[PDB]
């Protein structure tokens, strides 16, 4: 997260860390057994870390749970970035508590101008590398689809929307992918891609979770 702030500890209890020896992507807990992330975050083995604030300090109030299933959207495409969404089934259910809880799935598409919360442990610099141990947060509005499409001509598919600031300086960045964009208490977006980080007129591009509510329901049901 470039241009954000350190989140209040454990105040985003739906935020998870995906770990394969190190933190490499974010995710969102959507049920006791399932996490949503980005398909480009796929690895064959993933440890899910819930309840995290500082990824380098084992406080003891985290829950580390190995992934039992890791399912990219079958129509994910690494060239177009279409369908950049992934589901992870936990090998044992996450225990819901003050620090670990689910985020509601969206009931309507994202509305331009809505204030959202983007979060992750991504790079904090647009030029350079400064990766934070503590979870970072960014208050950012949904941009119009026209703003998104004009920023990336011919690249914004049906599965995508933009959140952020055209003036630059405030964006998600590398190591944020898979993490949540939450608007009005619902998970509207998954951190996906952008040209650089926090560049002027190049806002973050996010997967439109609403377009995958049926795929999520069907995949959870097929893998129970």
């Amino acid at each position: 997260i470039v241009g954000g702030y350190t989140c209040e500890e454990n105040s985003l209890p739906y935020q998870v860390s995906l770990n394969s020896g190190s933190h490499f992507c974010g995710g969102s807990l959507i049920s006791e057994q399932w996490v949503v992330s980005a398909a480009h975050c796929y690895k064959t083995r993933i440890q899910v870390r819930l309840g995290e604030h500082n990824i380098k300090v084992l406080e003891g109030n985290e829950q580390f749970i190995n992934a039992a299933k890791i399912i990219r959207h079958p129509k994910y495409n690494r060239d177009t970035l279409d369908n950049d969404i992934m589901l992870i089934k936990l090998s044992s259910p996450a225990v819901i508590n003050a620090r670990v809880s689910t985020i509601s799935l969206p009931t309507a598409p994202p509305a331009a101008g809505t204030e959202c919360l983007i979060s992750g442990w991504g790079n904090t610099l647009s030029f350079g590398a400064d990766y934070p141990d503590e979870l970072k947060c960014l208050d950012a509005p949904v941009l119009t689809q026209a703003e998104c499409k004009a920023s990336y001509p011919g690249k914004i598919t049906n599965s995508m929307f933009c959140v952020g600031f055209l003036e630059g300086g405030k964006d998600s960045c590398q190591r944020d992918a898979g993490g949540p964009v939450v608007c009005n208490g619902q998970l509207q977006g998954v951190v996906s891609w952008g040209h650089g980080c926090a560049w002027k007129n190049r806002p973050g591009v996010y997967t439109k979770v609403y377009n995958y509510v049926d795929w999520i329901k069907d995949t959870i049901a097929a893998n129970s």
């Binding site: 490499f24 975050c41 590398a129 998600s172 992918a177 996906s192 040209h195």
Partner: protein, 54 residues
Amino acid sequence: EVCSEQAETGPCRACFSRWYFDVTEGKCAPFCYGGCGGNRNNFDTEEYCMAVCG
């Protein structure tokens, strides 16, 4: 020419721990590969990067 390319995260926003040959240092350095796109100056490990580029 591969080893002269600048480090490229690519557009995706994961952090796959990778290495690139830094021509200003004459050796390899770590970076977050975002998980898509990028260029050929991109290697799993330091030793592999130096095997190709050193």
